[PDB]
Amino acid sequence: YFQSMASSHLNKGIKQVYMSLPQGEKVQAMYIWIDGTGEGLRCKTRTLDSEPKCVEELPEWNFDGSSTLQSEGSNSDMYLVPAAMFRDPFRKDPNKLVLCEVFKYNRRPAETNLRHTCKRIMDMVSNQHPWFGMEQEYTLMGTDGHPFGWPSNGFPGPQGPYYCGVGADRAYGRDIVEAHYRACLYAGVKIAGTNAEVMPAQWEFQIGPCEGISMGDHLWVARFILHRVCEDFGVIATFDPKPIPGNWNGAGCHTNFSTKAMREENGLKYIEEAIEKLSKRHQYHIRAYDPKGGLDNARRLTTSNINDFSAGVANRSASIRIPRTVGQEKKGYFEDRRPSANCDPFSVTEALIRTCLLNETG
Amino acid sequence: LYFQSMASSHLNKGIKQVYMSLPQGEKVQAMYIWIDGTGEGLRCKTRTLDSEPKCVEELPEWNFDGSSTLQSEGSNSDMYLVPAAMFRDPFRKDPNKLVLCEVFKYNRRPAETNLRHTCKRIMDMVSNQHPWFGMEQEYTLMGTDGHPFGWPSNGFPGPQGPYYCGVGADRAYGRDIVEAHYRACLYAGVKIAGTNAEVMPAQWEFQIGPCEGISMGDHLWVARFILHRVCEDFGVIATFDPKPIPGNWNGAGCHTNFSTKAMREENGLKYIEEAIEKLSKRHQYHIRAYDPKGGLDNARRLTGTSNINDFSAGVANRSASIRIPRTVGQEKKGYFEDRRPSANCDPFSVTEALIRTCLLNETG
Amino acid sequence: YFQSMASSHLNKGIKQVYMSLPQGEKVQAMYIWIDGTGEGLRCKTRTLDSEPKCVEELPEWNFDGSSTLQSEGSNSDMYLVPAAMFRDPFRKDPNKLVLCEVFKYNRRPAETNLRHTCKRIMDMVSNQHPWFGMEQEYTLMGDGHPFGWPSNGFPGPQGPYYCGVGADRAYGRDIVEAHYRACLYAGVKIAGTNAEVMPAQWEFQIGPCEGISMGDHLWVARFILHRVCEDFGVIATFDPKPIPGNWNGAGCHTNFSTKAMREENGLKYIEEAIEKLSKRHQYHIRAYDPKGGLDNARRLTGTSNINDFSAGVANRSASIRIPRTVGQEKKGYFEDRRPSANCDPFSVTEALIRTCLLNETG
Amino acid sequence: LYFQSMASSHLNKGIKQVYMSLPQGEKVQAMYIWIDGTGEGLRCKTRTLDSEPKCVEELPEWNFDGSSTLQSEGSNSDMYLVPAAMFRDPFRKDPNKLVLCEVFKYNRRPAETNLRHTCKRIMDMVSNQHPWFGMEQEYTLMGTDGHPFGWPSNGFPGPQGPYYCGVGADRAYGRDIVEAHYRACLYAGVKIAGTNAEVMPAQWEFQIGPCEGISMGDHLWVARFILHRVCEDFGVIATFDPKPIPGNWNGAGCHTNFSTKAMREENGLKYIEEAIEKLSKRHQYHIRAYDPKGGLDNARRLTGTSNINDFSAGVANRSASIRIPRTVGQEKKGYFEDRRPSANCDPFSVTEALIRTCLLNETG
Amino acid sequence: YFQSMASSHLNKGIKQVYMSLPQGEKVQAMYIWIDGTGEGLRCKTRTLDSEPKCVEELPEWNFDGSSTLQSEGSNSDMYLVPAAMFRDPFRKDPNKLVLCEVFKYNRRPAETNLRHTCKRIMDMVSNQHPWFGMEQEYTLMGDGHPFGWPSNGFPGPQGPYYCGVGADRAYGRDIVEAHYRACLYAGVKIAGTNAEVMPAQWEFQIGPCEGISMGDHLWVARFILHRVCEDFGVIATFDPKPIPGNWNGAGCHTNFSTKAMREENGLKYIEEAIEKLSKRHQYHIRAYDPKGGLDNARRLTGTSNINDFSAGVANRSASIRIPRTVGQEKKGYFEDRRPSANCDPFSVTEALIRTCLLNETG
Ligand SMILES: Nc1ncnc2c1ncn2[C@@H]1O[C@H](COP(=O)(O)OP(=O)(O)O)[C@@H](O)[C@H]1O
Ligand SMILES: Nc1ncnc2c1ncn2[C@@H]1O[C@H](COP(=O)(O)OP(=O)(O)O)[C@@H](O)[C@H]1O
Ligand SMILES: Nc1ncnc2c1ncn2[C@@H]1O[C@H](COP(=O)(O)OP(=O)(O)O)[C@@H](O)[C@H]1O
Ligand SMILES: Nc1ncnc2c1ncn2[C@@H]1O[C@H](COP(=O)(O)OP(=O)(O)O)[C@@H](O)[C@H]1O
Ligand SMILES: Nc1ncnc2c1ncn2[C@@H]1O[C@H](COP(=O)(O)OP(=O)(O)O)[C@@H](O)[C@H]1O
Ligand SMILES: [Cl-]
Ligand SMILES: [Cl-]
Ligand SMILES: [Cl-]
Ligand SMILES: [Cl-]
Ligand SMILES: [Cl-]
Ligand SMILES: [Mn+2]
Ligand SMILES: [Mn+2]
Ligand SMILES: [Mn+2]
Ligand SMILES: [Mn+2]
Ligand SMILES: [Mn+2]
Ligand SMILES: [Mn+2]
Ligand SMILES: [Mn+2]
Ligand SMILES: [Mn+2]
Ligand SMILES: [Mn+2]
Ligand SMILES: [Mn+2]
Ligand SMILES: [Mn+2]
Ligand SMILES: [Mn+2]
Ligand SMILES: [Mn+2]
Ligand SMILES: [Mn+2]
Ligand SMILES: [Mn+2]
Ligand SMILES: [Mn+2]
Ligand SMILES: [Mn+2]
Ligand SMILES: [Mn+2]
Ligand SMILES: [Mn+2]
Ligand SMILES: [Mn+2]
């Protein structure tokens, strides 16, 4: 598969003229789901008679699973169940985005529905109020399948000046980042921040703190919003953990994590206990942390090493880093730096709970 | 060697504007800004706040990865950001903020390129004398091929003469950047005093001032950030190099105007002339404070518009190290102009040197 | 010197977003003056604490005369004294444009400050209320070939372009429309516009303006035109003969009346003024361009020929024309058709007063 | 105003070469060349002959339309062409010929721009003194937009210095024209003595000489024709304007070297110095003979590389009106150099003036 | 100074038609000399009545030294004395190329005439028959970025380009092939070629050349390279470090033997010569580029470091290398790896003789 240039050269002002027409009483709801790859998002739209006040008043829907690698033509309809509702930043109020769970012909969860089991697990431990903060790293890619703004058939200068950089020779693609940030605020996604990363054309947004199942919900809708923003601009966002081989930064999805007890005074005690637990389960977490069970991360994890578990205060080379502020106040949260940028947050967050809170072993 | 990238400037800017039009809701963006391991480069990142801060004191401390800015090691990387000065964000609009910070190491001591820490102390020592500064930031707009903006491909425009304070498609190159920057600075609350085209084509200038004490450095550094961010939108680069094009093409400085309460009062020329006398004994100390390479950058500029090895002063003399403007000479009160600072100086280093020499009576 | 392409290829939509930010309580004042060439306009901007209500509230300023061929680097400061204030059409209310007179280090007028003596002369005859109306002709230039002309060649022969309409007749009307509106917003007394005979050649009229204000309004109208052309990436030339041969030249025809010429039977005093003009032709030719005649020498071939004085009613071939309506009604004004398009209006208007009203000879 | 046309240079030149390869048979082409009503422009046309002429005397008279060259009226238009000098045609190859002609009016008197007629008579008057001339034709290669060939679009290259006798993609602009012209002139039988790059980028030079008497003008004019025809194939223009680019860019001349039998014999410097003395009394007459506008063209060049109003001479002095080359000074025999002639002079006018002043002892 | 595009877009087929015309009996001689920079080559052409059979039949000539920074306009003539003649590869038989020595108005050598003293030194040791072999490294440049490199960026890291083959490794071989053939036709003693480590970087070797002929052949080989590059519209740079950082620098390594070093057990005299070299390192660094060391200072970081002298067998990190074969066979030559690519060979070869054979000190 290749990028297609034609759409980005369409006249965008014409579109804005149409989008300015007042739409009347009817409401658009764009249903969003995960396909048979476990990585690709799909969407379509229905008109509703009036504005829903919450996710619960959205009707069930369905799609053709024989066109998403999930079912067979002769018995095709698959189920969509509203999970999380947001305001649509592409169409504006009263219009909605709806992230859904997918079920089979028999009402059984689809194989790539990882939210179903994750929600049960989060319910088991809600008394401990688990909070997550995920740092989505990504690379903008241009037309030729080469990173956005890089020289054709070539490389820019060595890494160094791009991290948190400003100027036409440092920051590539800030228009995407700015529009995504604002789109997430309007939607009601819990976007905590942004920065430029170390590889040129590589960028980052943070989603959090989100309690339990809302983590995966917010991150998946944030990813959807990014791809749709990028589409408008004609560029591609990749969550590949090592888009360019060699001495060019990979992309992760660092997962920050705390429990009520970790956040309370001297909760550093419970942080260290959780890290201890994680230290005995490194390979299980590696298999949960990218969609190919570790094969994607093997291209990135030279930052920490893929075979080795480590932990330390302010150590950006360790598997797990305790932020310096957390080490100082003796409470807060810790950072798992192992998740690949293309991980599924429902898989990552469930594994943390199972290892750290439900004391599963193996 | 780093080149610019053309791609970002060819993105559809009307698309960005439609997204920037969405009402953002109750949350507020704060972009923290700081100086990196080179002492010249600016860095930034953004967090979301619960509500609008009413003053810099309400903003939280933060941190960053110093191993990615040439400031710390990867295994012990977190470095501190402590808010110093807050402005309105002209790129995102109210309720959003820009936050210039100081940088501190893992052990809470100031980073090597944190020159505001000692400068603020010095300004506190002399606050009763109310030191005011005005700085004239000269710069050159550069294109995409490392060649000045608007210049012929692989060549030169006509000789210097018509471009200074010039008007027209064949005189003024890049006024769009200038106009946008002036308005971005007024919206932000940066104390922008004025603008002009300079003598080299594609070279411009803005003045920041009069700023009391430590606010000079603050306002200057935020003004430079704004300029980099404006040029970024347009796909051009601003260089503060003191001699971007060798030969008979104008260099770039950061002329620093200065007065105390006593120099501003009637007959304060007496105190202006005393301060200039102290400066004449410390030429070389000021040259080492007046660019990031200790004089090496200015050596390409200060040829004879003063020579780098000779100290001079005179009324209305744009060839001297120090100029007394004619109006100050006539009125027998005001300020004087140090024309020595390189365009790429750090205002914290320049302001502090002037105070140490002229007011704290240091020698050597 | 050549035009630079690049600024016209900057994204003008970006600038407009920045200019839409509310500026607050500070005010920009752009000071404008004439340089050592006597034809070049220079400008720069200062921030003010509040909005001035008339010109006399604005402060004196100064500039580097060593960068404008007016003084030496070692003693470089030159004075700017505000003379006339307008509203700024480029930055809007409350921002101002301010035409200044230039003075030397010793407070004496600069060589190219012709306003100083002109104002004194206008004051000596205030009771006769001289009004002036000036017709500024100019050509829009691209590469410096006229704007819209074939690359390395020529459009069809003159005939259809005068007051013309259509893609094949009117070259550059965008400029003309923007300029007209900018002048109305500024408070410049713009009286009308038209397309002239040479393709890419256009005209605006400033007037009727009393005494010293003619020079002020016309100089500010010229600055407005250069700045408007700048935005569009084109150049305006007031050269009297930009293209040699059988292509129209460019004048600044100067219409002139006193209170007496305007009252009933004022034609008597018009004819009396033209009679005084007939004896002083070479004096006026030397006043009527910055090279003392050598510029007009390229235009005044036949149009009147440079060394020959003539007057007639409705005669567009004469040095002086009395318009048909003025002849019919026996009152009004007459037209001096001799001034080059690059004349200084201070110089032209002073010469008319000295000859026609102060009865000077030699 | 006339511009060049780009279309002809984009035609497929390999196609032309295939046709030019056909053996042409027994018939011969003769291209007649003459000077038009401006005194500067060359014109040509071609006839077919029955066989190859062995000398210019075997070529027939011809004629043309003088109403189309600014020389005669449409109702009585035929004008005469009388062969003066024959060369081999380097554009069509042997057996084909180039024929420089004199122009004569309907009444068989010489055209107003026929300056060879009187010049030939003068040369006959002094043939016993064997006047030899060598002329240094300077010229500038111009592009397609009236701007010098290779120069940046709407701009200037780096300052003069490296381009004189220069080598490299960033020094030598247009050497293809030069190399082709040199070979075209040798094939033709034009007495080409040498070439060099000049001080302005895109400016070159060739020498024609030593030519006795009237052959100087002949060989020079045919060399210029060859140069125009070569540049035409390549799509560039050669200008003989004495100052194509105003300011600190080199002008173009046609330095005229000159000797008689007596100046060439041992101790002939004595006769060189006598001739230079006669020239010093007639500076203004020679300036009026030395460009087609009587001095007006050279006024843009001769600024001070001699001033137009002052006569000077010196050994090895490239700032003087007349230079005695060092080798001539040393050897006490040879020639001297008149550096005054404009690149656009007519060699018939220059050579004749030198003879009239130096040998026929005319005054005024 | 910038390259000019236009000449490379001229129709080169047109030129070849003209160069195919039989020239007749006259002969072109192109005289070549070194200018006031000590690095720039200058040339011009005279017609001769017949073909010279050796250099001594060619006449003296002269040039304008005021246009080459060697003399003043009012006394401008400088002498050219033919030194070495070659066949002209650009114009063919019977046409010649002629390297000259330059002299002042008073017959004394020009400041940048280093051949004069070098020849005298070579004559003092003719019986020892010094041979030299020089390895000229250079980079092909476009806009001045290296030729074939990405616009505003960088090719992949060094490794595959050395002695490389393929569109993705060898940049500019057309030049190298044409140059090699032109040198063989000329009679220049070209010994070989290769692609070097930096992409667009190449090398030719001239030698073994006895005494003064080394400087002559290498200077003529450099002129041939500049003229060949000119045809192709590219530029050759002998700068020692054209691209900063981790991109190969450029030397002119100088191999050196006397008759004694070449006979059996000559290694003894090699080692003896290197010993004399070890005491005079700074002398040679000052001889070994035109800025007396300041150019080599950009290259001699580590390659040897500028202030440190070292020698070893097969050591490409040393100042002096004794090749492996020379060590094995106990006879031959040694390599001085210190000379910058922009050295004057007259200067280098003279220094070797003075130090190693005339036993000079200080
Ligand atoms: N108590 C907490 N529990 C879980 N996550 C948290 C907590 N406090 C903050 N976070 C989240 O941690 C994340 C930190 O991301 P970031 O600022 O990129 O840190 P760094 O770059 O230092 O790793 C943010 O998403 C934030 O919302
Ligand atoms: N009393 C003062 N002390 C310090 N600075 C001052 C004082 N008065 C004015 N200034 C500042 O001096 C600067 C003058 O800059 P500019 O107008 O570029 O002057 P010039 O170009 O004539 O050197 C402005 O920033 C202004 O705010
Ligand atoms: N009484 C008057 N005194 C001076 N100028 C006048 C008077 N009445 C009109 N004018 C001016 O004369 C000018 C006429 O210009 P225009 O319409 O171009 O005339 P035309 O093209 O017929 O010569 C206008 O500027 C107008 O304001
Ligand atoms: N005895 C002579 N009489 C006339 N001309 C001569 C004589 N000897 C040489 N010449 C000519 O003088 C010209 C010298 O031109 P050139 O080499 O450009 O000299 P420079 O550039 O030093 O002025 C050549 O045309 C040459 O043929
Ligand atoms: N006896 C010798 N004396 C001087 N130079 C020699 C001798 N033998 C060979 N050479 C020269 O030494 C040079 C070796 O260059 P090259 O093949 O590039 O070597 P390397 O790449 O191994 O250093 C060639 O110019 C060759 O002619
Ligand atoms: Cl849809
Ligand atoms: Cl950010
Ligand atoms: Cl301004
Ligand atoms: Cl023909
Ligand atoms: Cl040549
Ligand atoms: Mn982060
Ligand atoms: Mn990150
Ligand atoms: Mn990182
Ligand atoms: Mn992190
Ligand atoms: Mn200033
Ligand atoms: Mn300035
Ligand atoms: Mn200045
Ligand atoms: Mn200043
Ligand atoms: Mn009119
Ligand atoms: Mn008109
Ligand atoms: Mn008209
Ligand atoms: Mn009129
Ligand atoms: Mn010459
Ligand atoms: Mn010459
Ligand atoms: Mn010359
Ligand atoms: Mn000459
Ligand atoms: Mn080698
Ligand atoms: Mn090598
Ligand atoms: Mn090597
Ligand atoms: Mn080697």
From Swiss-Prot, chain A:
Domain of life: Eukaryota
Outcome following mutation: residue 321 to C: In GLND; reduced glutamine synthetase activity; decreased function in ribosomal 40S subunit synthesis associated with loss of nucleolar location of BYSL
EC number(s) stated in the UniProt entry for this protein: 6.3.1.2, 2.3.1.225
InterPro entries on file: Gln_synt_N (IPR008147), Gln_synt_N_sf (IPR036651), Gln_synth/guanido_kin_cat_dom (IPR014746), Gln_synth_cat_dom (IPR008146), Gln_synth_gly_rich_site (IPR027303), Gln_synth_N_conserv_site (IPR027302), Glutamine_Synthetase (IPR050292)
GS beta-grasp domain: residues covered: 25-107
Chain residues that bind Mn(2+) 1: 135, 254, 335
Impact after mutating residue 12 to A: Increased ubiquitination and increased proteasomal degradation
Sites bearing Phosphotyrosine, chain numbering: 105
Tissue: Expressed in endothelial cells.
Gene Ontology cellular-component annotations: cell body; cytoplasm; cytosol; endoplasmic reticulum; extracellular exosome; glial cell projection; mitochondrion; nucleus
Membrane topology type: Lipid-anchor
One of the Pfam families matching this protein, by short name: Gln-synt_N
Region annotation Required for glutamine-induced ubiquitination by CRL4(CRBN) and proteasomal degradation: where it falls in the sequence: 6-26
Compartments it resides in: Cytoplasm, Cytosol; Microsome; Mitochondrion; Cell membrane
Binding-site positions, L-glutamate: 247-248, 316, 337
Cofactor(s) of this protein: Mg(2+); Mn(2+)
Binding site residues for Mn(2+) 2: 137, 197, 204
UniProt keyword annotations, A-Z: Acetylation, Angiogenesis, ATP-binding, Cell membrane, Cytoplasm, Disease variant, Endoplasmic reticulum, Epilepsy, Intellectual disability, Ligase, Lipoprotein, Magnesium, Manganese, Membrane, Metal-binding, Microsome, Mitochondrion, Nucleotide-binding, Palmitate, Phosphoprotein, Transferase, Ubl conjugation
Reactions listed under catalytic activity: L-glutamate + NH4(+) + ATP = L-glutamine + ADP + phosphate + H(+); L-cysteinyl-[protein] + hexadecanoyl-CoA = S-hexadecanoyl-L-cysteinyl-[protein] + CoA
Self-association and partners: Decamer; composed of two pentamers. Interacts with PALMD. Interacts with RHOJ. Interacts with BEST2; this interaction tethers a fraction of GLUL to the membrane, causing a decrease of cytosolic glutamine synthase (GS) activity and inhibits the chloride channel activity of BEST2 by affecting the gating at the aperture in the absence of intracellular glutamate.
Assigned protein family: Belongs to the glutamine synthetase family.
Protein's name in the database: Glutamine synthetase
From Swiss-Prot, chains B, D:
Main location per the UniProt record: cytoplasm
Keyword Isomerase recorded: no
Triggers of expression: By glucocorticoids. Vitamin D and the Wnt signaling pathway inhibit its expression and activity. Glutamine synthase (GS) levels are regulated by a negative feedback mechanism where elevated glutamine levels stimulate GS ubiquitin-mediated proteasomal degradation.
Domain of life from the UniProt record: Eukaryota
Outcome following mutation: residue 323 to A: Decreases ribosomal 40S subunit synthesis. Loss of nucleolar location of BYSL
Phosphoserine modifications at: 342
Disease with which this protein is associated in UniProt: Glutamine deficiency, congenital: An autosomal recessive disorder characterized by variable brain malformations, encephalopathy, severe developmental delay, seizures, and decreased glutamine levels in bodily fluids. Death in early infancy may occur. Developmental and epileptic encephalopathy 116: A form of epileptic encephalopathy, a heterogeneous group of early-onset epilepsies characterized by refractory seizures, neurodevelopmental impairment, and poor prognosis. Development is normal prior to seizure onset, after which cognitive and motor delays become apparent. DEE116 is autosomal dominant form characterized by severe developmental delay, seizures, and white matter abnormalities.
Assembly, per entry: Decamer; composed of two pentamers. Interacts with PALMD. Interacts with RHOJ. Interacts with BEST2; this interaction tethers a fraction of GLUL to the membrane, causing a decrease of cytosolic glutamine synthase (GS) activity and inhibits the chloride channel activity of BEST2 by affecting the gating at the aperture in the absence of intracellular glutamate.
Protein family (similarity comment): Belongs to the glutamine synthetase family.
Name under which the protein is recorded: Glutamine synthetase
Source organism of this protein record: Homo sapiens (Human)
From Swiss-Prot, chains C, E:
SUPFAM superfamilies (UniProt xref): Glutamine synthetase, N-terminal domain (SSF54368), Glutamine synthetase/guanido kinase (SSF55931)
Binding sites annotated in the UniProt record for ADP: 333-335
Description of what induces expression: By glucocorticoids. Vitamin D and the Wnt signaling pathway inhibit its expression and activity. Glutamine synthase (GS) levels are regulated by a negative feedback mechanism where elevated glutamine levels stimulate GS ubiquitin-mediated proteasomal degradation.
Domain GS beta-grasp: start-end pairs: 25-107
Record localization: Cytoplasm, Cytosol; Microsome; Mitochondrion; Cell membrane
Chain positions found as Phosphotyrosine: 105
PROSITE patterns named among the record's database cross-references: GLNA_1, GLNA_ATP, GS_BETA_GRASP, GS_CATALYTIC
Impact upon substituting residue 12 to A: Increased ubiquitination and increased proteasomal degradation
Modified residues (N6-acetyllysine): 12, 15
Cellular component aspect of the GO annotation: cell body; cytoplasm; cytosol; endoplasmic reticulum; extracellular exosome; glial cell projection; mitochondrion; nucleus
GO biological process: angiogenesis; cell population proliferation; cellular response to starvation; glutamate catabolic process; glutamine biosynthetic process; intracellular ammonium homeostasis; positive regulation of erythrocyte differentiation; protein palmitoylation
Consequence the record notes for mutating residue 338 to C: In GLND; reduced glutamine synthetase activity
Descriptive protein name: Glutamine synthetase
